[PDB]
Design a protein around this nucleic acid. Structure first.
Length: 182
RNA sequence: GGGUAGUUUGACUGGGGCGGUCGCCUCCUAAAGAGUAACGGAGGUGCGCAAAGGUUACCUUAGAGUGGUUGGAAAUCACUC
């Protein structure tokens, strides 16, 4: 059995058809879809505290399911007293089935558990179908336990879509039921 | 141990002294092969690396704009040029 995420089932069985009708696309897979979700977290203070970076990496692992990579400093800078090549950030890429499952978990479970959650700004679009927005308290995810955290942390989420514009991606996200603050 | 004796105590230098310089490497002067002077104009150097060497395989920056927890002009992430 090719086990399939419920999001993938929902997409393939409805969303393709509604978007074809709604945007008069000539051929079927002119329809937008999702290629990757990038979860990033920038801990510049890790240059003092290694525990911060280790905790962030581990908490990302529990949140998603796959291990993270610690990015390095592209350029040595003094304003943040950064030496080139130091460990500064940590990111995870989600694709395919894991991507769909994580987005389902997020939209239905973790966005609800945010303090004063009143939707998400439906305008954080880079003009090319890529939607990036932040979450300040990772504790919204029930996966991580409260006691073991060493410092409350946030993280940025970027959703990359095959769409050529923002309208297409916003329509796809709305069909997915993404709680945009509107 | 200058009581006594034998000697040394550089050169370049718009006179000599004083100052500065003395080997090697890069550019200009150098007039489109090479070479070419001045106390002409700007710099470096008396090392470093057990990989920062050898080879195989795979990747591509910086900048500007744009969307983003602290994050600000600028950190990390994504896209366009």
């Amino acid at each position: 059995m090719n086990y399939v995420p419920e999001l993938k089932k929902y997409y393939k069985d409805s969303v393709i058809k509604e978007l074809v009708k709604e945007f008069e696309y000539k051929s079927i897979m002119q329809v937008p879809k999702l290629e990757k979700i990038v979860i990033s977290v920038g801990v510049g203070e890790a240059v003092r505290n290694k525990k911060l970076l280790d905790s962030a990496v581990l908490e990302l692992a529990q949140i998603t399911g796959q291990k993270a990579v610690k990015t390095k400093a592209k350029k040595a800078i003094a304003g943040f007293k950064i030496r080139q090549g130091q460990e500064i950030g940590a990111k995870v890429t989600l694709r395919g089935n894991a991507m769909y499952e994580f987005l389902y978990k997020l939209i239905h479970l973790a966005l609800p558990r945010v303090k004063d959650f009143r939707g998400i700004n439906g305008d954080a679009f880079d003009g090319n179908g890529n939607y990036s927005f932040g979450i300040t308290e990772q504790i919204i995810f029930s996966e991580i336990d409260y006691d073991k955290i060493e410092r409350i942390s946030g993280l940025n989420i970027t959703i990359v879509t095959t769409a050529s514009n923002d309208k297409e991606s916003k329509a796809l996200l709305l069909k997915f039921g993404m709680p945009f603050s509107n």
